[PDB]
UniProtKB/Swiss-Prot annotation, chains A, B, C, D, E, F, G, H, I, J, K:
It is found in: Nucleus. The lineage of its organism: Eukaryota, Metazoa, Chordata, Craniata, Vertebrata. It comes from Homo sapiens. The chain holds residues 25 to 208 of 418 of the full protein. The full-length protein forms heptameric rings. Interacts with ABL1. Interacts with RPA2; the interaction is direct and associates RAD52 with the RPA complex. Interacts with RAD51AP1. This is DNA repair protein RAD52 homolog. The modification Phosphoserine is found at S175. Belongs to the RAD52 family. It comes from the Eukaryota. Involved in double-stranded break repair. Plays a central role in genetic recombination and DNA repair by promoting the annealing of complementary single-stranded DNA and by stimulation of the RAD51 recombinase. Changing K128A: Abolishes ssDNA-binding. Coiled coil: none annotated. The modification Phosphotyrosine is found at Y80. Phosphorylated upon DNA damage by ABL1, and probably by ATM or ATR. Changing Y41A: Moderately defective in both ss and dsDNA-binding. Residues 128-132 bind DNA.
Amino acid sequence: CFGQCQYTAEEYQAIQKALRQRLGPEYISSRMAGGGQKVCYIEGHRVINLANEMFGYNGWAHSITQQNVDFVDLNNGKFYVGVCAFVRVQLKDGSYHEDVGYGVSEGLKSKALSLEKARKEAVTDGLKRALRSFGNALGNCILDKDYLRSLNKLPRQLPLEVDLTKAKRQDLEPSVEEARYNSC
Amino acid sequence: CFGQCQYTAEEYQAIQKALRQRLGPEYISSRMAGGGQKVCYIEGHRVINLANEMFGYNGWAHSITQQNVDFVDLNNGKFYVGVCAFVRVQLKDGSYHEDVGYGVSEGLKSKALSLEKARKEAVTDGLKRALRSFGNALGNCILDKDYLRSLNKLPRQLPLEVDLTKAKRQDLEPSVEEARYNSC
Amino acid sequence: CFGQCQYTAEEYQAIQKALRQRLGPEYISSRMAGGGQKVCYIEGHRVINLANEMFGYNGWAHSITQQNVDFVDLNNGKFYVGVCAFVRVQLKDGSYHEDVGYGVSEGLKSKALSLEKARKEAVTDGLKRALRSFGNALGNCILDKDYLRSLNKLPRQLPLEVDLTKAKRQDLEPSVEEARYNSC
Amino acid sequence: CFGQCQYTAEEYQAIQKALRQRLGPEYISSRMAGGGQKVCYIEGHRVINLANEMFGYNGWAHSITQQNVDFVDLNNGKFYVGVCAFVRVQLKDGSYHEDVGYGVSEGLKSKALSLEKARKEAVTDGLKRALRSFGNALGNCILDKDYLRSLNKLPRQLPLEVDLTKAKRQDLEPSVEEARYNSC
Amino acid sequence: CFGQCQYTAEEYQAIQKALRQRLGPEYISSRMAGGGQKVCYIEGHRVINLANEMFGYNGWAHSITQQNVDFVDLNNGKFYVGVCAFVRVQLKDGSYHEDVGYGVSEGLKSKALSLEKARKEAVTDGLKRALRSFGNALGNCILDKDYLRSLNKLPRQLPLEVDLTKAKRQDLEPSVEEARYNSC
Amino acid sequence: CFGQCQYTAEEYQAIQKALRQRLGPEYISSRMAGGGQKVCYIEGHRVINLANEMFGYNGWAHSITQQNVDFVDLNNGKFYVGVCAFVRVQLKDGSYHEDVGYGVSEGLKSKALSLEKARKEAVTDGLKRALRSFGNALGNCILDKDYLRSLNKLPRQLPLEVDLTKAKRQDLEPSVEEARYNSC
Amino acid sequence: CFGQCQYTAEEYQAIQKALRQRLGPEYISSRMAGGGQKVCYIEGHRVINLANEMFGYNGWAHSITQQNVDFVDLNNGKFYVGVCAFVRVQLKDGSYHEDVGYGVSEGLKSKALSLEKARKEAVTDGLKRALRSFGNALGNCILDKDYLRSLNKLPRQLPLEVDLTKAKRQDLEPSVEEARYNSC
Amino acid sequence: CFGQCQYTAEEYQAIQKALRQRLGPEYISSRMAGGGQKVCYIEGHRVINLANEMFGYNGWAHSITQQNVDFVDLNNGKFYVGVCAFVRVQLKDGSYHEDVGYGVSEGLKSKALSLEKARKEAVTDGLKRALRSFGNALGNCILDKDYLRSLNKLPRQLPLEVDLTKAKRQDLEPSVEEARYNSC
Amino acid sequence: CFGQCQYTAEEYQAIQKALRQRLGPEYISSRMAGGGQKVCYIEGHRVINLANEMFGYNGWAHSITQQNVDFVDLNNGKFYVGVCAFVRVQLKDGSYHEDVGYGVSEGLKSKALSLEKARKEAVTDGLKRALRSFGNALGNCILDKDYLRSLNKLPRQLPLEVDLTKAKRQDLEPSVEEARYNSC
Amino acid sequence: CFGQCQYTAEEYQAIQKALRQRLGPEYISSRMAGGGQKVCYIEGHRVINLANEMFGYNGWAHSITQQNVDFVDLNNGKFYVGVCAFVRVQLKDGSYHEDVGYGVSEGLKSKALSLEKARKEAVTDGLKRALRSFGNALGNCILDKDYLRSLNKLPRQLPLEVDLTKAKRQDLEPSVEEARYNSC
Amino acid sequence: CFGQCQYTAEEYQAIQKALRQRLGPEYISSRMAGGGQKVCYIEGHRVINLANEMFGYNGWAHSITQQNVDFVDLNNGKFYVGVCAFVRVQLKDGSYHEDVGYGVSEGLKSKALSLEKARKEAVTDGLKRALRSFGNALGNCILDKDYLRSLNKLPRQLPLEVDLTKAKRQDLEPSVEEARYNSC
């Protein structure tokens, strides 16, 4: 099962090579560092899908070891919250990597919304930082300065159109339901 | 049994493909962010059924690792409550994902009702964020901006009529009761 | 035994299909939300029997992970109590779901009665919310708005008459006592 | 042994059916709710014997997970005590249900007696509410309103005469002592 | 061994039936409830012997899960002590029942004697309440009102004369010493 | 070994019968209850030898689960101490009974001697009460009122003369040393 | 090994008989009870050798479950110390007996020497009281009043002369060293 | 699996030799020590990839044993934060090394940003320091002074151009997906 | 291994006999009890060598269960320290004995030196007291008064001259190194 | 695996001999003791490489049992920090040695930098001191005074030139990647 | 492996004999007791090498059970620190011995240096004291007064000259690398 399974030579080699790949500009994003420059990053749902593809929906897993709210300060009706979270990712073979994630909220007048924001972000930021340990294909390149420069020198493509034609429209999954029944 | 069972090739493949699917507009919903714009999300019962289909009623499970009431403030007879919950989802093979959920209640004059709302919501919010990790089909797309735009550019269909003709009207389940008896 | 046993293909398929069923109006009830509208819900004993049927008296179980009394306030001779309970339900194969239940009591002059009410309700509310995770047949539809509308558009039938003719009148159970003796 | 044993198809089916039965009026009792109406309930020793029959003296078990004394107030020489208890019932196959019980004492001048009453009641109430989870035959009907009305519409029979002719009059049990000696 | 052994069909059936018996008036006793009426109960050594017969000296066992002294008050030279104890009884097959026992001491000038009384009584009271769970022959009848009335309607027999002719007068037990030596 | 061994039919039967015996007047003793009447009890060393014979030096065991000093009060140079002990007795087959003992010291001017007396007595008291659970032969009769009356109605025999002729006079045990050597 | 080994019939019987013996006057000693009479006891080293003989240097074992210093009071330059120790003795077969021991020091001006005396005595006392549970041969008779009287009625023999001719004079042990080497 | 697998002669030898290698200037970087000289170090993503190559994405793992925020001081609107983290790296064969990492932030006005920096750096710094323990190829040379001098005496090469032509542009990985499917 | 190994008949017998021996005057020493008489004792290194011989360097072991510093008092520049230690000795077969040791320092002006002295002595004293439990050969005689008198009545021999001719002069041990290598 | 593997005669013998070697001057370094003389030591990276060679990158491991910050004092803008670490080194066969390391920082004005220095140094110091236990080749000679004198009487050689021609220049390791793949 | 392995008769006998040896003057050293006389002791690295030779680099192990800083006093700019350490030493067969070590620093003006000295010394001191338990060859003689006198009566030889010609000059160890590779 999980934690038990050992990678086969074929899967090992494939994944080992694959993880080396660098991400295209279709994955990177940016925000304006407070006072600083443009900071690139990969959106959460991206990294999640990347993983599901690299290891399969049931080939990787993560858990929150711990989340600690550093502080919740109030400066004239505005809330400044700092939160950290420790996430640990594990592959089906027992292999694992753990890292710290950090969430922040410095404006909002709502305390609830400030926490919700910091807590959720800290986790995702943790999961992402943890998966980067597996290779460039999961984000380890995002840190490489040389990598970044090579990104600007590229055609700043425009958002991809999402074709929702073959989108799931109802619950049932005959293909799946069948395979499963034959699994008993 | 659960946590033991390993996915067969057929089921694995089926589920792995299925999970890639994006959700149709029949799954999305929206609220008016306080001051913000329109926020899309998927209702809980939806995500639950999606999973019961993707993995089977007994192919997935979840538990609340911990729930912490961040605060319960009283501003002139009105209650402002913030709650967070950590939910861990596991598949029958041992695979697992865990995330934070957040519940909020900022109006109500009733303390009881304010907490009930925040505690319940934090959990459901947690379970949803947890299953998102498994793929788009369980909500990982809901975050994708490109995905969202492609949703507006679609026929805003009207609520589906629920045919309660073949609805369950009594307790007994002969089909089930039979297969079970033969299981002893 | 329990937690050990794995579902046979027959039983798995039956239950998997059965759980999809939506409940008939014979299961729903309503209360008048304080200020709000009509709130639908399924009475506890209902959800219990639904479960004993879907899984067998010994095919499901539940336990109280934890129950915490949120507050016990006294406003002019009246008690306002808020209680939460975490219930975990487990099927015979190890499968499980856990959720928060909430109990409330806002009128009563009796402290004892206010707590008894809030504690007991929190548990049952927890148990119900946990079972909902298994599918529509155990309550997951009760949340579906489309489901609800289709309920109103139905013949508001009248309470079912309970035929107590074949009701149990004494302790002994020959049919059972026999099967058991032959089980040694 | 206990927790190990699995139900045989014969015993499972028998008990499964029996538990569906509804209790006759020979099991129901009533108290006058403080201000409220008539409340129906099943006396403790009743639920005990019902279970010793449905599962055999050694087929079910319960334990007190926890008992917490909520409060012990003194209002002018009179004691108001509220106690809760969590009881877990388990069948010989590992199956289990756990619920909250509540004990109350609001009159008495003796503190000792006030606690003895609430603590013992809380336990029994817990055990009864736990067993209800198994089915109607163990009290899940007592909650059904429809069930109740049908009870009033019945011949309010008079207390049963207890024939103490074949009552146990000495310690020894030749029948048992024998089977046991042959068990070594 | 103990906790391991499973009941043989012969023993199970015999004990199951015997436990249904109701106790004769030779087992009941009475005290004058403070202000209340006559309270019937079974002395402790009685319940002990009843159990050593129903299950054999080594077929049942009990332990004190916990004992808590609720209070020790001093009202003008007199002590008022309230103690509770949780006792768990287990049969050789793993079967078990646990209950609360209560001990009370309200007059005495001696603190020591007051506690000694309450602690010992709480335990025994706990043990008796736990054994009642097995059936009428161990005290589950003592609670039945119908049972009680039938007791009054009986010849209030006089204390049994104890024949101490064949009473044990020395330590050694040849019969036993022999069987044991042959057990090595 | 101990806790493992299961009683053989021969031993089980012998001990079962033997434990039923009532103790002769050679076992009983008495003290003058402070203000009360004559209290009968069995001296510790007696109960110890009774057990060593009924079960063999290695057939039974006891441990002090816990000992709590309830209080140590000083009233004008005199110490008043109350102590309780929880003793658990176990037979070689795993069978077990646990009870509370109580030690008291109300006169002494020495604190040390007062505690020593209470702590020691509490344990012994506990051990005796625990063993009583096994049967009359181990003290369960000492409680029976009918038993007691039958004791007075007997020839108050005079102390037994102890013949120290065959008393052990040196350490070595040839008989033993031999059996042991052949045990390797 | 230890706690594993089971006594063979030969050894069991031998030890079971030998433990019944009563100690000769060569084992008893006496102190003058502060104000009280003459108190008989068995010196520590004696009980140790008795045990090493009854069971073999490796057939019995003891551990200090706990030692608690009750108090250390200072009355005008003099220290009054009370200490208790719980000792558990175990035989190679798993059999065990645990008791309390107590140590006292009431004169000394040295705090260190008072504690040293109390702590050490409490342990030895504890060990002796524990061993007493195995039989008269290990001290259970020392308590018997009838035994004591029979002791005075005996020739108060004079201290035994210790022949140190065959006393060990150097470390090595050829006999042992040999057997051991052949044990590898 | 992981922690279980043992290195084969071929892989052990290869890795053993590889780890000896010193890093080229393509790996080293520098910062201006506050007041001090030029400090060389290896950026995190570098060390990560180095490891993924030396051991394979699933041949090594790390976890945060603990992270402690040493201090968070505020000197005139500026935050001074110090954090330490303990990271433990483990190879697939059970081999392991653990070290301390330290994160620092001494300028920033934002508390949130000051912690995020320190916490994240402390972890990476820890992971790097732990990996150094495996050999020069993972950073152990970076400390060697002689090594450093030989680095300046080298052609200070210019940043490497990153060719993003064969960069990953979409989620799916056919090569992998295939190998995986054949792994079931 | 250790704790596992069981003594062979040969070794058991040899050791059992040997332990009976009494120590010659070559083992005893003396100190002048503060105010008291001459106190006899065995130096530490002696007891150690005695044990290494009786059991083999790997046949016995000891651990410090606990060491508590009772007090550290300062009376005019001088330190008075009292420390106790609990030592547990175990033989290779699982056999064990545990005792209390006590360390004292009452003169010294140095706090450090006072503690060093008492902590160290407490342990050794503990180890010695624990080994006594195995027999006279390891010190159980040192307590016997009769033994002592016989010691004075002996030729107070003069210190033994130590022949350091065949003393170990270098680290290597060819005989050992050889047997070891062949042990692989 | 690790902790499991047992050395083979060949490897044992080789390492046993090699560990005896004394380090050449190429390993020693020196600092100027505050006020004291010249202190010799071995740089961290040296010991690490020495161990990777003696045991193999996967033949030894270490962990930080605990790290405690002793003090952080501030004397006029300067920080004096003392820290200790307990490191435990383990060889692949289970063999292990543990020691204390100590880190110090006494000048710096920065608190962060002072701690980082002390925490890091304590661990490295710990690791070095722990590895010394394995023999001279890992630093045990560094203590030997005689060894040190012989070092001064030697040609104080000049720093070794590091040839970075065959230095690792890219991530991939073909030799390794190959062997690994064949390991699946 | 370690803790598992059992000594072979050859190795046992060899070590058992060699441990008896007394150390030559080449192992002893001395310090001038503050006010006291000349104190003999064995230097740390000596004991370490002695052990590596008696047991093999992987035949013995040690750990620090606990280290407690007794005090850190400041008397006019000078620090007086007292520290203790408990060290447990274990042989590959499971055998073990634990002891207390003590570290002291009474002059220094630096707090850091005072602690570093004491903490380090306490551990080494503990380690030596623990190893002594194995026999004279590991230092148990260093205590013997007769042994010491015999040392003075010997030629106070001069420091041994350390021949660093065959000293290790580079990391690699061909002999070992070979045996290891063939071990896979």
